[PDB]
Curated annotation (Swiss-Prot):
Subunit structure: Part of the 50S ribosomal subunit.
Protein name (record): Large ribosomal subunit protein uL15
Origin organism lineage: Bacteria, Pseudomonadati, Pseudomonadota, Gammaproteobacteria, Pseudomonadales
Disulfide bonds: none
Protein family (similarity comment): Belongs to the universal ribosomal protein uL15 family.
Species of provenance: Pseudomonas aeruginosa (strain ATCC 15692 / DSM 22644 / CIP 104116 / JCM 14847 / LMG 12228 / 1C / PRS 101 / PAO1)
Composition skew (Gly residues), residue ranges: 21-31
Whole-protein residues included: 1 to 48 of 144
Length: 48
RNA sequence: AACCCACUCCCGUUGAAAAGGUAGGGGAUGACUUGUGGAUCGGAGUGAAAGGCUAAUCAAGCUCGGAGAUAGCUGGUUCUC
């Protein structure tokens, strides 16, 4: 039990995904928003 | 003639010049031209009226704030399997 020897259980922590970083990441360019439209823009939210 | 203007042609258009020049042209004692100082201004002023002019900016000047106004619209969005 050292400070450089303890970690969390598998699956307890994930990494978050970052849109707009290259092609190989799978979330590049549009970043999961599809193409043009209201719900592809900054503040483009449909009211409840 | 000076002075004030700006009708025509040409040149110039990266100009000598962000509106000129050479030739010609109109008024030239008058509703004339001009120096100095002053007054009126932003939905306001001034206008022998062209929506003209208010510092090369005018169907509502410039500047700083509300303010990162709003943009169902264009553009862009970065390593790997
Ligand atoms: Mg994909
Ligand atoms: Mg998605
Ligand atoms: Mg696009
Ligand atoms: Mg579409
Ligand atoms: Mg869509
Ligand atoms: Mg926005
Ligand atoms: Mg003179
Ligand atoms: Mg001639
Ligand atoms: Mg002349
Ligand atoms: Mg003369
Ligand atoms: Mg006469
Ligand atoms: Mg006088
Ligand atoms: Mg005043
Ligand atoms: Mg105004
Ligand atoms: Mg008219
Ligand atoms: Mg000024
Ligand atoms: Mg002016
Ligand atoms: Mg506000
Ligand atoms: Mg903006
Ligand atoms: Mg296009």
């Amino acid at each position: 039990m050292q400070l450089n020897d303890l970690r969390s259980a598998p699956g307890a922590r994930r990494e978050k995904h970052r849109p707009g970083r290259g092609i190989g990441s799978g979330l590049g360019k549009t970043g999961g928003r599809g193409h043009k439209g209201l719900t592809s823009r900054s503040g483009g939210k449909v009211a409840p």
